[PDB]
Amino acid sequence: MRECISIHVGQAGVQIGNACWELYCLEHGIQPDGQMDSFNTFFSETGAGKHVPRAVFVDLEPTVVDEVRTGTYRQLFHPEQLITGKEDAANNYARGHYTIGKEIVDLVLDRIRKLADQCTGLQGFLIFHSFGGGTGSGFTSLLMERLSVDYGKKSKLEFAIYPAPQVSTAVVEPYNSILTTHTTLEHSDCAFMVDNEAIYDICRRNLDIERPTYTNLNRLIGQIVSSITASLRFDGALNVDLTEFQTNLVPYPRIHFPLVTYAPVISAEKAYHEQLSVAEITNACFEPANQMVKCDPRHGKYMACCMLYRGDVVPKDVNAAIATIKTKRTIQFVDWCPTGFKVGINYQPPTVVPGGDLAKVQRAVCMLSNTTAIAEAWARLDHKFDLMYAKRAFVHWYVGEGMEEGEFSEAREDLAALEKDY
Amino acid sequence: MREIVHIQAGQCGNQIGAKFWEIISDEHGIDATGAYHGDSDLQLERINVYYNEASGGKYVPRAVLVDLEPGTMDSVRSGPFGQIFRPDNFVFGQSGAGNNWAKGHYTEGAELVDSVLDVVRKEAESCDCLQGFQLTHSLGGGTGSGMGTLLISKIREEYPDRIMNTYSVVPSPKVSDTVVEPYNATLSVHQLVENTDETYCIDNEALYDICFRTLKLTTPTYGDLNHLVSLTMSGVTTCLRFPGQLNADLRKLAVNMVPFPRLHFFMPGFAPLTSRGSQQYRALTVPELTQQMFDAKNMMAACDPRHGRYLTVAAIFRGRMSMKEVDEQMLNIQNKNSSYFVEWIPNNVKTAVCDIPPRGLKMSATFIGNSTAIQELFKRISEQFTAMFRRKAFLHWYTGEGMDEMEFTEAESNMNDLVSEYQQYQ
Amino acid sequence: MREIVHIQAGQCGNQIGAKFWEIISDEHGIDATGAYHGDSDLQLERINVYYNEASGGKYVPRAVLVDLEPGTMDSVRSGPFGQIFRPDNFVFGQSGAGNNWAKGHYTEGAELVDSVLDVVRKEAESCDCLQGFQLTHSLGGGTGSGMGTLLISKIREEYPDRIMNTYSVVPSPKVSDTVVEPYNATLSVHQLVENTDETYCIDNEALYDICFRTLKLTTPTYGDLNHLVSLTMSGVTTCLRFPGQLNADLRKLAVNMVPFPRLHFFMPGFAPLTSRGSQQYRALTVPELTQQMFDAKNMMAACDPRHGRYLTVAAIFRGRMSMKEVDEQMLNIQNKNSSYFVEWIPNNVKTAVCDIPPRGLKMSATFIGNSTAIQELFKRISEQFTAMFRRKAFLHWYTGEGMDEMEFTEAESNMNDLVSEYQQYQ
Ligand SMILES: Nc1nc2c(ncn2[C@@H]2O[C@H](COP(=O)(O)OP(=O)(O)OP(=O)(O)O)[C@@H](O)[C@H]2O)c(=O)[nH]1
Ligand SMILES: Nc1nc2c(ncn2[C@@H]2O[C@H](COP(=O)(O)OP(=O)(O)OP(O)(O)=S)[C@@H](O)[C@H]2O)c(=O)[nH]1
Ligand SMILES: Nc1nc2c(ncn2[C@@H]2O[C@H](COP(=O)(O)OP(=O)(O)OP(O)(O)=S)[C@@H](O)[C@H]2O)c(=O)[nH]1
């Protein structure tokens, strides 16, 4: 026995946390109130037939928190773990990092500290947020360094909604993205991808949902986190811990930004049309378009590859499929990283939702790597930042939060050094 | 939560605010008296932003009515939905500045500043958290501009952190309704560069031509102008008032629209706008709107952005569609309008969607954009001011209210610096 | 228990006391005759404070009616609730001082002092324990002020330990109803600095303006003034009359309001005060009252506290709310009104709540505060007295009643010392 803590900041973070808790509740049979020992990794035993999520819901705006506390799962969540803000940063990293974040970071730090107090087997921290959101950038970053300074070497996992190259809710998104990336770089143990446009494209072409909604995105995150945490929440042939995830993909602290991909995303009518075998599902998932990242991995080199099989998957078939994956030349690896393969097998089949886009299947695989194509996105973001900051636009907004342009500039050069480190 | 207090100045401003209030009563399911009858919880969940907690299951608008004459006062109160306002919010003068900025700002504004500050402070304190303000007035008029300037000054010195927007009505270049209206615009802009965080410029002749041609009406009226104004109204404020997959507020727009403190003038937008025998034949799809987002026909403040360059664009949507279509449409808009767009502000389209469409339309789209086209308007205003100030005509009315020469000189210098900065951006 | 005897002087005082008595009959469930019909035990549990044990299941007010003329006598007795008073409490003169202090205090007061002392002693002895007294009169009037001075002197020499309050009516500065009213105010205050433990100053024009503007009445009358007076009435005395989570009495207020024996003048307060078409639209919450606690509009005794400094504030509440909201509201009131407040009296807000709200209102709030604003009123009175005493005009009427020069000199010297001490506090 062991536990983990999930952190949700901003609208995207709150929605993601709610969806993930919906998964964890329906997978273990939790009714909306909390009733009917691996489920203790995310829920706490007190009283009689009771469980509550080990999470904190915080946002500078109370709209999403109000929406959460109006669902049928009010009884499921403790009221005190929901935090309501008053002044949304409005896509401003500095606003949510200094003006409102500094006076509300205390209660959250403080009581996630108790969440660790009753969880002596705290494996790590889960963070869900968005770069585009000013709250989800600033408050998330500051609480990230607060976690680092209050826990030391404790493992921490970040799930960030990176704005897409052509999808941006706010035009000031480069400022928030660059600022948060420079601020939390040294402490970000592992940060993933989310490309909204790639999610929409995959849903429209794979699930063939011409009119999807953010619920599809919500379980897109939900299924990813479920596949990641199945090892901790269910036994398997070779379970994988959170520590090994950062051990394999962080030989150097500078590069800790791996991309994620799921296989498969198939509707029930199309699930009738295809049953999964290891070779086909892996080679489909390794296909660049199947990746939920809008960056072709074949442009650069591959760091490492991690497989997360769940269900009735034969390890020998895994080895054979992975080998025949290796031999083909569409896949290339760095010279000094010949053997960077880790496989995690779990016996728990992926869980379905009623009325969901995904189809109920006994087996699945999670696609886990850090390709060099992320450098393309980083360079494009840096170029956009240079263009839109060259005339110094929207800077006065961050100035009114009380800093001058210097920190913007050296964050730009820090991220440039990160980009050229490849 | 995030309460917004409405203050209306001038006859046009009072009419605009009233029409807004009936439109909000439609959108939130409020009858002519104040009772709620909406069929969905979404209308009444965030009713407190524009309404207050009234006894007997009622709601009253968070509005402040200011004028120097009670003529439009009586017409508005005796008009539709006049009983939804308490008599206390109606405070009026008895002299009238007579389309004079100095009179309405110093002579008659001296005995109205106390009342307007008292009522706005009462509205601010009686609410939970005042997110910001919204003011409507006409820069062509003299009194309304003076009330706008006085209120923005008092708000800035009282609530320097609470942002707002001013929906001022710039006089039409084609028609000189008032001889001394250049002074009014001069002083109003000189105070706006200084006491307002962001401003939308609403020009008459552009909406007149839209009603004439786009709507295909042979008899345009103030009613249609107030209707489109209320559509702009709802389009900007629906993200805060109504739940959305991409939630937004006035603070988000202000952050996304203001690159420099003095560069805060933007030109609002609305679409689609089609008649009965075109709507049943037009495509009710996004491309029909994206061809309508960028055009000099459905264009708001009479200065063509094609001559200048767009600073950045904000687009709010209300309906049932996916988001990626919007993103690719914005990308195509950049791809084809690159020359009309600015090269050094990549992805300058601000994308957000409110889930709830307005009453009677399953889409509405509000185009919030900024371009250096307003440079032409400001330069023409400056040269007109120079033209009839070189002759020193009609200065006696202002100098009789405690005016001075070099004051107007630094006013015109401020607009000169503003237009020079806008040209430098161009 | 803690019985209070009411004595009314002058026509205005008699009307005020009567209106009080009907209001108490409402609050305690007493009909026009005296029978009890209240629906709760709380009304009739402490009825003995203002009523006496009457046979046949009846109750009569503990009131004393004094006048020098029977005109208002007959109107009051023949008016509503006139049968609830025994004929013995009505004692009247037959001459009338004619708005003269000296006449009503020496000439006609000589044959009324015996009667008033006899009746007040009968009321005191017939009761269990007389907690204190309450008197109503007008300082503008001559006779009423003389009766007030005589009664406070006799009470002080007879019951020096039993505190009271006097609800005197200071003449309005704007209107000179009586030419010799400055003498009346002079002598009344000279006796009040000396025979009264604490005094509330009630000024006409302030309540007149409140009825005109705050209540929005085009025809203010004495009835509304007496109504608001009876609200002040109930607001002060509800803590003693009715059970409360924070029980209080007149002794608590006197201890909390009097820092120096000569510094005992305070300016009462009432809220909320809203009309039919504002009450159904206003917020029936505490903040709507706390914005109404501190204002020159709903303000009682015509001198602005903003110019001066508050000494200390007492706030009594009647309704259904928690107490911490009141405490934090008082803290915010300090935080924002620190300049208007006194720095060397920290936490100068006296907080108490009576559980039972008045009839017809689920909150009423009575603002008992003290400020150095009354310094302006006293200084203006002193300078007026100097102005028309330098000319020695209208002195013959007073000197014919046994008056003298340096007596008025030490009177004006006493007000000079009082105003100097108040300025020193400021
Ligand atoms: N993938 C995904 N992203 C979402 C979802 N909801 C919101 N987002 C992200 O949120 C961004 C919009 O801004 P928010 O993060 O909501 O900003 P906010 O919550 O208002 O916080 P502030 O900007 O500080 O006021 C978008 O760019 C999205 O990337 C969702 O359901 N799915
Ligand atoms: N769109 C629109 N414009 C209006 C409306 N009413 C007046 N206007 C415009 O406003 C301008 C006059 O502004 P106005 O507010 O009337 O000046 P004013 O200073 O307040 O006039 P006064 O009170 O001193 S007499 C005119 O050019 C007119 O076209 C209206 O209802 N809708
Ligand atoms: N609020 C209020 N004020 C009143 C009322 N009646 C009289 N007054 C005020 O009291 C003042 C006169 O005081 P008053 O008591 O009538 O003098 P008086 O000395 O008793 O008059 P007299 O008996 O010698 S003839 C006037 O200024 C008047 O405004 C009343 O019913 N309500």
Author numbering:
A (entry chain D): 1 to 36, 47 to 432
B (entry chain I), C (entry chain H): 1 to 44, 47 to 360, 369 to 436
Lines quoted from the article behind this entry:
Microtubules (MTs) are important components of the cytoskeleton networks in eukaryotic cells, responsible for cell shape determination, intracellular transport, cytoplasmic organization and cell division. A pf is formed by head-to-tail stacking of αβ-tubulin heterodimers. The GTP bound to α-tubulin is buried in the α-, β-tubulin intra-dimer interface and is non-exchangeable and non-hydrolysable, whereas the nucleotide bound to β-tubulin is exposed to solvent and exchangeable. A tubulin heterodimer with GTP-bound to β-tubulin is termed as GTP-tubulin, while that with GDP bound to β-tubulin is termed as GDP-tubulin.
In an attempt to study the early MT assembly process using fruit fly tubulin endogenously purified from Drosophila S2 cells, we have found a similar intermediate structure in the presence of another GTP-nonhydrolyzable analog GTPγS. Notably, unlike the “GMPCPP-Tube” made of bovine tubulin, the S2-GTPγS-tubulin assembly intermediate can form under physiological Mg2+ concentrations, thus closer to the native MT assembly state. To improve the quality of the helical order and distinguish the α- and β-tubulin, we have incubated the S2-GTPγS-tubulin with kinesin-1’s motor domain (KMD) in the condition for GTPγS-Tube assembly and have got a more ordered helical assembly decorated with KMD on each tubulin heterodimer. Such kind of sample has enabled us to solve the cryo-EM structure of S2-GTPγS-Tube at 6.8 Å resolution. The 3D reconstruction of GTPγS-Tube-KMD is of good enough quality to reveal important interactions among tubulin dimers in the helical assembly, which consists two layers of tubulin-KMD complex, the outer tubulin and KMD forming the first layer and the inner tubulin and KMD forming the second layer. In the Tube, two different types of lateral interaction interfaces are observed between neighboring curved protofilaments spiraling around the helical axis. One interface is the same as that in the MT lattice, the “MT-bond” interface, whereas the other interface is unique in the Tube lattice, therefore named as the “Tube-bond” interface. The “Tube-bond” is mainly sustained with the interaction among the M-loop, H10-S9 loop, H9-S8 loop, H3, H4, H6, H9 and H10 helices. Our Cryo-EM structure of the S2-GTPγS-Tube demonstrates that the tubulin heterodimer adopts a curvature of ~6°, between the initial curvature of ~12° in solution (before assembly) and the final curvature of ~0° in MT (after assembly). Comparing the tubulin heterodimer structure in solution and in the Tube lattice, we have found that one side of the “MT-bond” brings a half curvature change and a rotation of intermediate domain, where the M loop changes from unstructured state to an ordered helix.
